[PDB]
Design a protein around this nucleic acid. Structure first.
Lengths: 832, 812
RNA sequence: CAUUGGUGAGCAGCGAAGGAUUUGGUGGAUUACUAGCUAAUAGCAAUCUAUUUCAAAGAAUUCAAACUUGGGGGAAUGCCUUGUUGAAUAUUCUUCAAGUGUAACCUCCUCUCAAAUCAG
């Protein structure tokens, strides 16, 4: 009820770095602002890892088999992640800016393109325990003149070639005794060689440069070595390459041009399959599978991802998020639905497990600000600075009726009665609470009495009276029913905003400018008690701040407050790095949460590093966009004083760490907050962290573990084999004294398998008590996994309660029958 | 001895130990290789950043350290490690059982001496090769040649000449041949330290007297001498920077600096290293730089520089004294109490009998910084009480820290030795803060903990009073009196509502914190030595003198679990991050690990050392032990966060072909089982040689023969078998068959069937027993039926429980 | 009288071989530690020079190439474009016009404000 852990980050589908699929084409790895998201395409689910990076990610790969994940910052922070286990194994620091990490197809060793250096390291072992210094640098190849921009292995591990912004594209081996076999360099291009490749046969070499050129290198005659047999030019006129991949087993080039165009070729032939305009915005990364039938693009001009097939004209996902523009967030009464609004207008509909915008609504023209659900999560509304509140349903996914005012006025916040007629909106301009009927587009009442803006509004779940927040430091509670049209002010003394009611509707959380949240009675007028937030808020000092965070007034209030589903807790969130969980009656915060730990995010750090405070100025506040190799990144369009305006590049600043919208789940007390980075999910759904067991097996290994007394691990080694002789060996082998010791430590992966094995075998078995202890220990062990996914165990549990009643409770009814006949026949008397 | 849940990662918090460290160069720059027991460390000299650690703990402690350019040569017991980058590339195990004393590197050779007064020679397999792997020979020093081998050095421009110095004299060898090319005469003092020289031919020797001898070999003569009054020399070094300067390191901690041209000492440093821990253990000028790196046995490694000379006209005469430069220190004594400071497992507080805190950083070994003990100028104005010879704070027995309001006031409370109060410290300012918190009943502070709101520190006296001081102004709030013995562990709940305390009276007191009432008072058996609380899950654990940790629920106001199982005084113990486990360590050299939902010791680590403090990280990753010897903090990776391990009760015992399997009939005798085959027999039955065999089982008063064919009797024939029971007066075959059934349920197999036979008795002779109710013969056997019968409600307690849980879990 | 003002005397009071203040310099952290240099599989680090050089590999928009300009005018003189003229050998160059042609080249704007003062 207190312990909330990070579960999943949603959206902002690409910022910076390399995109990769796994061994299988299911798992797609993308960078987020500092995290890695994994999108599984067929089993449509999304995931983002529990950790974050310290700067923006500029390099990424995963293992051959999907065991290790390497994320590397812009600076060269490297993070070793147990990819199957989602836990961080090692933080190494590469001291140079690297651009490419690629594992071996062997999986034995990976390599790194940092500067003009190639660093080739051995892989750390996953089944081995975590060590202090796991990484062993095998070799370092520094035969390059400028920064090495692209890098590949062969399909054998024994050949690696890298390419730089220097003209060179150079092959070596892993091992130096394989140096003499092939160790040479390629030149003769015009420009940045942006990608050089082996073919699927290791005899043809493809080298692609920025100018639009490919050479077909081949170890051929006029001993004799390595001529160009042909060149290939796509003849892009002013456009030039940004990114290039090559799928070798089908001989396919994916190109990304500066003009947002992209081409496909068949490389011994060099024949144009199709040209797609991905957009105005260039492909910043291309990717193929080992199957080579999906392609993955990312535009870091927009922040979009695109999985599209080359052979069939068909996308998989065309996802386009919006940074700094996650305005509203909305839990449904159902715990399966989530609504995110935006300043661009898009209002997306997410599942919490499968993190996909299932729906969107791109019909608002301006910023959408406040969204509440009503009537069992059927209808869902959207007040806007677009001058309207547009209604939305979750069955037809359509606009119902765009409630309008007179003078086309923007609307600050939205409140919906559960009785689905009454929708109130407060305005940032007009400061009159407009009440719309849902059935009639006319306004029901123009509630007047706000001097300065109406900040926020909510109704009770109980009496459905509304509480609006002035900027005149004064709550106005309106009771519009019983034909009174009656009002009451509550004077606060400092400037309130972000109002939030208890579900009982007799107490209200208020956030003043002091940070002090107050709780107000509604059946009476006085203040109940007030909890302080100006002390326990993590605020950040910007690099351009000229005052320390201890006496900074940047973010020590709260831009959103929410009551818990008992009404006994509150999660509040503001323009800070800090999200807070106060207890309502005990009146002291339970836990304080970071939203994001990113140096490029501005107000993350409490204390700035004094090595960056130079003579006159920061060390980072110097304009470094003027040194980019590309003209477009050297172009500055930043208008000076734009605060949360349209695009990212036009702040002329780092993005502030701010969290706009905060809500609780009804069911499992999970709270989600749409941040600057995107929607974050904290939950109490603990042990959804997926945990592989006993990773590489014989039947002898589990049976030797029976001889080795390693009985839970022997059960795992049996259940990976799935032969019922072994399961009845290992099942009756463990003693009773460690049955609940075993069953609480069973993963959820074999949970329907073990529940079905118990549910089937125990029906015909004499070990009724022994099976019964297993079902007791399992249902007391991990019944919560059957609380969430009921249809997952529905076949197994059916057999289980077949065994409980027909097989076991028949024996019990026999027992109680003979018992009660004993009690009668020994407690009563005779005759004669 | 091996752990399954945790594993050793490194011993955090150590810089050196006193073993003479080695210096090396990469190109222009310098690295330093020091020893910590069985694990060596490498440093840049220009920042004292940690560069490498050993890939393995060595099986015995490293005795010697030498270092060439990329290869660091460690020397433990019989074997010598050739390490590149802290990784064992080549172990050279010497062909004695004598212990390796000293070591040196020159040419294509390696030379290492043992304590059998014999040096071993190890050639490179080629000059093309880089590390020496070929075993050349063993030469020795017999007691006409020299004494006990103090050092092996190679003075430069000496072709294959090995300079072996003893307590007596100096020898020179051709290690290609193996011939003693020269023996020096005895110096009359006991030679203790050698050092080569940037001049030719000279070896400097610092003896057991305060005497340093410059000694030639081309002369064979002791060219100059240098005296020291009443100090035992430990290290010698030469400043090769550009003025001829000599470094004399005592074992009294003092460092003496000479200029041999002016024939004068320059400055003597006093007490740069602790005298009791070996004095100055090794000091060495970095070659061609005015920087001397000193290393003490107080887990400390300092740097000093000569400033360039102020005299423009002179230079060499006017010398600035050496000046403090960067240093990595550790706890000189072993650490008494540790804790995990932050939430993200970045910092650990470690307090020792060195009388100091240290704020170690498990992220980066250089952010590890010693805390200040500098009092704020007292807010009253009247002056404070203490000696003007300001001593360190007395060593600490308890620690307390909450990072809720960090850096707005103090948030570290430390219970010093034999002080009536306990000081407060800012974690952020790395310095003891303004308030000190008293007992106000004139007893010692014996346990402290702080409020999670960061506003209260709780202080438990040796006379029982618990004071609640405020972290705002240092003011007290309430002084609770429950215990008349000592308090020994305090806590608050995570909501700051209900506070617990454990005492040396055997009382755990439940008080409210918002309210002021004593809510509950649980009396445990032995007095209660410590208290650990889990804020996320509202439990609290305690060690008592009954060698066993009781975990007490704070809601249900009673014991939830007690782990018996230890063998001695339980030193430290800790919950998990999530309350699933408790790590305990006791004086029994065991560190056991407990799964509290069940309550079984699921692994215990046997250690060579006694583990004093264990500390589970708030993150689910790290376990910190501190031992009784050893000054660092053993960090342990938690494998459960990575894959898993087994959870068995296996501690006290230490401390196929046909791919098919027939079922076991009965696993243990205590469990109940049914009849092999059809379950439908109950549904059938419920919807003479026989009586002779029943008699022959009755005369045994064991009826195990009857039950066999009783299962195997055809179900319709039993409808005449029980309907002929021969009992009108004696009721024998009634009592014979009923006791046959009760002996049938005794082995618990075919449990349902004897119930069916009992109900078939009621179908057959319920009137024959009923009209003769009160008869003490059949009533005895039915009393025996109830006594055997009353255990098996445990499956009715299983079936109803498991059924309701199944329905409740499917529906909700 | 409150001084709740400090000076000023003092005293109770605190109080271990001083107390209080102010500042210079330097070091340590202020992101999570795998060593320096080079031509880099290796050599160096007292040195790469009297093997560093031969060798191979290595040349498209047949000239795509201001993605970049404060806004108006014009744009004489330049340039661009085609129209058009001559010369040389299928192309440059001489000559010439038409261009609400033009980041060359000419001007107008991109200063005068409920800021304050001042007579009425």
């Amino acid at each position: 009820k207190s312990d909330f852990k990070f579960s999943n980050l949603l959206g902002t589908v690409y910022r910076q770095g390399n995109i990769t699929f796994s061994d299988d084409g299911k798992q797609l790895l993308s960078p987020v602002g500092n995290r890695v998201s994994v999108f599984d395409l067929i089993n449509n689910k999304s995931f983002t890892f529990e950790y974050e990076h310290r700067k923006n990610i500029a390099a990424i790969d995963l293992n051959k088999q999907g065991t290790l994940l390497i994320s590397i910052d812009e600076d060269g922070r490297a993070i070793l992640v147990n990819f199957k286990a989602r836990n961080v194994l090692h933080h190494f620091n590469f001291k140079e800016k690297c651009s490419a990490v690629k594992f071996s197809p062997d999986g034995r060793l990976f390599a790194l393109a940092s500067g003009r250096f190639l660093q080739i390291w051995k892989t750390p072992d996953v089944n081995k325990d975590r060590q202090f210094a796991p990484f062993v640098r095998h070799r370092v190849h520094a035969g390059h003149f400028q920064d090495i921009t692209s890098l590949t292995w062969s399909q054998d591990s024994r050949f690696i070639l890298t390419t730089s912004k220097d003209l060179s594209a150079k092959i070596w081996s892993v091992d130096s005794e394989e140096k003499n076999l092939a160790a040479t360099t390629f030149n003769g291009h015009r420009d940045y060689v942006m990608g050089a490749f082996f073919s699927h046969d290791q005899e043809k070499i493809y080298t692609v440069s920025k100018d639009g050129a490919v050479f077909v290198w081949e170890f051929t005659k006029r001993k004799y070595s390595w001529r160009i047999t042909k060149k290939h030019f796509f003849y892009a006129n002013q456009a030039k390459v940004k990114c290039v991949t090559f799928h070798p087993a089908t001989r396919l080039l994916a190109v990304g041009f500066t003009s947002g165009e992209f081409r496909l070729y068949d490389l011994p032939d060099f024949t144009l399959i199709q040209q797609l305009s991905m957009g105005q915005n260039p492909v910043n990364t291309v990717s193929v599978n080992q199957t080579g039938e999906w392609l993955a693009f990312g535009s870091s001009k927009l922040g979009q991802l695109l999985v599209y097939e080359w052979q069939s004209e068909s996308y998989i996902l065309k996802q386009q998020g919006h940074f700094d523009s996650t305005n509203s967030l909305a839990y449904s009464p159902d715990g399966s639905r989530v609504v995110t609004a935006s300043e661009d207008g898009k209002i997306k509909v997410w599942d919490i497990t499968s993190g996909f915008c299932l729906a969107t609504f791109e019909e608002h023209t301006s910023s959408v600000t406040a969204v509440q659900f009503a009537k069992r999560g059927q209808v869902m509304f959207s007040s806007s600075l677009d001058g309207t509140v547009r209604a939305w349903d979750l069955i037809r996914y359509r606009n119902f009726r765009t409630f309008t005012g007179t003078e086309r006025i923007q609307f600050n916040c939205l409140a919906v009665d559960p009785s689905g007629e009454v929708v109130c909106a407060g305005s940032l301009d007009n400061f009159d609470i407009h009440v719309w009927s849902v059935q009639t587009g006319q306004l029901l009442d123009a509630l007047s009495g706000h001097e300065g803006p109406v900040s926020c509004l909510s109704f009770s779940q109980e009496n459905s009276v509304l509480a609006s927040a002035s900027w005149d430091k004064t709550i106005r509670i309106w009771s519009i029913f019983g034909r009174s049209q009656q009002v009451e002010p509550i004077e606060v003394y400092s400037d309130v905003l972000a109002l939030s009611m208890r579900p009982d509707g007799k107490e209200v959380a208020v956030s003043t400018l002091k940070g002090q949240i107050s709780i107000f009675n509604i059946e009476d007028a006085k203040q109940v008690g007030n909890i302080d937030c100006r002390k326990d808020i993590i605020s950040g000092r910007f690099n351009q701040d000229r005052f320390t965070a201890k006496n900074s007034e940047r973010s020590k209030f709260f831009t959103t407050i929410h009551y818990s589903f008992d009404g006994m807790a509150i999660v509040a969130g503001g323009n800070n790095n800090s999200i807070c969980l106060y207890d309502v009656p005990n009146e002291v915060l339970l836990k304080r949460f970071i939203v994001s730990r990113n140096m490029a995010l501005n107000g993350t750090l409490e204390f700035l590093n004094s090595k960056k405070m130079t003579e006159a100025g920061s060390l980072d506040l110097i304009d470094d966009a003027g040194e980019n190799s590309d003209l477009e990144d050297r172009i500055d369009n930043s208008l000076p004083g734009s605060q949360r305006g349209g695009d990212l590049s036009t702040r002329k600043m780092r993005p502030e760490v701010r969290v706009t919208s905060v809500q609780f789940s009804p069911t499992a007390n999970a709270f989600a907050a749409a941040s600057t980075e995107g929607l974050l999910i904290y939950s109490t759904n603990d042990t959804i962290l997926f945990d592989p067991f006993d990773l590489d097996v014989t039947p002898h290994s589990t049976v030797e573990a029976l001889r080795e007394k390693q009985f839970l691990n022997a059960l795992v080694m049996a259940f990976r084999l799935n032969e019922e002789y072994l399961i009845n060996k290992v099942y009756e082998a463990i003693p009773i004294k460690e049955i609940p010791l075993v069953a609480s430590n069973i993963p959820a992966i074999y949970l329907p398998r073990i529940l079905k094995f118990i549910g089937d075998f125990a029906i015909e078995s004499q070990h009724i008590e022994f099976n019964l202890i297993w079902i007791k220990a399992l249902l007391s062990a991990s019944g919560g996994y059957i609380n969430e996914h009921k249809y997952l165990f529905s076949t197994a549990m059916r057999s289980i309660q077949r065994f409980i009643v027909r097989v076991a409770k028949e024996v019990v009814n026999t027992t109680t029958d003979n018992k009660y006949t004993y009690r009668f026949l020994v407690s009563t008397d005779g005759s004669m | 001895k091996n752990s399954k849940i945790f594993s050793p990662f490194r011993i955090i918090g150590n810089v050196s130990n006193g073993v003479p460290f080695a210096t090396g160069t990469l190109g222009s720059t310098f690295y330093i290789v020091t020893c910590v027991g069985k694990t060596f460390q490498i440093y840049d000299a220009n920042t004292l950043h940690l560069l490498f650690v050993s890939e393995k703990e060595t099986p015995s402690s490293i005795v010697a350290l030498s270092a060439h350019f990329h290869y660091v040569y460690a020397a433990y017991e019989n074997k010598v490690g050739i390490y590149k980058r802290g990784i064992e590339e080549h172990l050279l195990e010497l062909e004695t059982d004598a212990n390796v004393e000293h070591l040196c590197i020159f040419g294509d050779y390696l030379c290492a001496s043992t304590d059998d007064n014999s040096i071993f020679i190890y050639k490179k397999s080629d000059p093309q090769d880089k590390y020496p792997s070929e075993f050349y020979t063993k030469l020795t020093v017999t007691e006409i040649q020299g004494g006990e081998i103090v050092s092996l050095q190679h003075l430069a421009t000496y072709l294959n000449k090995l300079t072996v110095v003893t307590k007596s004299n100096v020898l020179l060898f051709n290690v290609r041949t193996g011939k003693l090319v020269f023996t020096s005469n005895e110096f009359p003092d006991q030679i203790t330290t050698a050092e080569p020289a940037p001049v030719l031919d000279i070896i400097a020797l610092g003896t057991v007297t305060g005497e340093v001898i410059m000694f030639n070999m081309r002369k064979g003569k002791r060219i100059r001498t240098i005296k020291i009054p009443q100090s035992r020399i430990s290290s010698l070094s030469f400043r090769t920077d550009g003025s001829s300067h000599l470094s004399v390191g005592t074992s009294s901690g003092d460092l003496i600096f000479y200029d041999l041209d002016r024939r004068s000492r320059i400055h003597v440093l006093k007490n740069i290293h602790r005298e009791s821990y070996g004095g100055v253990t090794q000091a060495t000028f970095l070659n061609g730089q005015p920087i001397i790196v000193t290393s003490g046995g107080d887990n400390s490694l300092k740097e000093y520089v000569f400033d360039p000379s102020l005299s423009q006209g002179s230079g060499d005469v006017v010398v600035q004294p050496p000046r403090y430069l960067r240093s990595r220190g550790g706890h000189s004594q072993p650490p008494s109490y540790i804790a995990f400071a932050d939430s993200q497992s970045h910092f650990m507080l470690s307090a020792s009998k060195d009388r100091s805190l240290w704020s170690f950083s498990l992220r980066k070994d250089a952010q590890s910084q010693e805390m200040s003990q500098r009092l704020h100028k007292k807010q009253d104005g009247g002056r404070v009480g203490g000696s003007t010879i300001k001593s360190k704070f007395p060593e600490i027995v308890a620690l307390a820290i909450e990072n809720a309001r960090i850096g707005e006031w103090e948030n570290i409370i430390t219970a010093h030795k034999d002080e009536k109060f306990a000081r407060t410290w800012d974690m952020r300012n790395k310095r003891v803060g303004r308030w000190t918190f008293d007992t106000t009943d004139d007893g010692f502070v014996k346990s402290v903990a702080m409020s999670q709101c960061g506003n209260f520190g709780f202080i438990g006296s040796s006379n029982g009073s618990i004071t609640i001081y405020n972290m705002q102004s240092g003011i007290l709030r309430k002084k609770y009196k429950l215990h008349k013995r000592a308090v020994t562990g305090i806590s608050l709940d995570g909501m700051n509502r209900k506070m617990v305390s454990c005492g040396l009276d055997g009382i755990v007191g439940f008080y409210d914190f918002n309210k002021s009432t004593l809510l509950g008072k649980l009396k445990l058996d032995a007095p209660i030595t410590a208290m650990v609380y889990h804020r996320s899950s509202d439990l609290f654990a305690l060690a008592l003198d009954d060698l066993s940790i009781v975990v007490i629920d704070a809601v249900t106001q009673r014991v939830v679990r007690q782990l018996w199982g230890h063998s001695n005084r339980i030193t430290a113990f800790d919950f998990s991050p999530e309350g699933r486990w408790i790590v305990s360590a006791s004086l029994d050299s065991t560190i056991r690990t407990w799964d509290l939902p069940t309550g079984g010791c699921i692994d215990g680590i046997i250690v060579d050392n006694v583990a004093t403090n264990v500390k589970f990280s708030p993150n689910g990753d790290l376990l910190a032990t501190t031992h009784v010897t050893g000054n660092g903090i053993c960090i342990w990776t938690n494998r459960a966060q990575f894959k898993t391990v087994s959870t068995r009760t296996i501690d006290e015992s230490e401390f196929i072909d046909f791919n098919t399997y027939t079922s076991l009939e009965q696993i243990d005798k205590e469990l109940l089982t049914l009849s092999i085959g059809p379950r439908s027999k109950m549904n059938t039955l419920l919807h003479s040689h026989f009586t002779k065999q029943l008699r022959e089982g009755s005369q045994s008063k064991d009826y195990s023969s009857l039950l066999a064919t009783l299962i195997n009797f055809s179900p319709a024939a039993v409808d005449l078998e029980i309907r002929s029971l021969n009992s009108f007066e004696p009721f024998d075959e009634i009592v014979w068959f009923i006791d046959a059934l009760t002996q049938g349920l005794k082995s618990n197999k075919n449990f349902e069937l004897y119930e069916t036979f009992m109900s078939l008795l009621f179908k057959a002779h319920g009137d024959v027993i009923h009209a003769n109710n009160k008869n003490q013969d059949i009533a005895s056997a039915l009393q025996n039926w109830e006594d055997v019968h009353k255990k098996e409600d445990r499956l009715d307690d299983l079936v109803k429980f498991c059924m309701g849980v199944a329905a409740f879990v499917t529906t909700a």
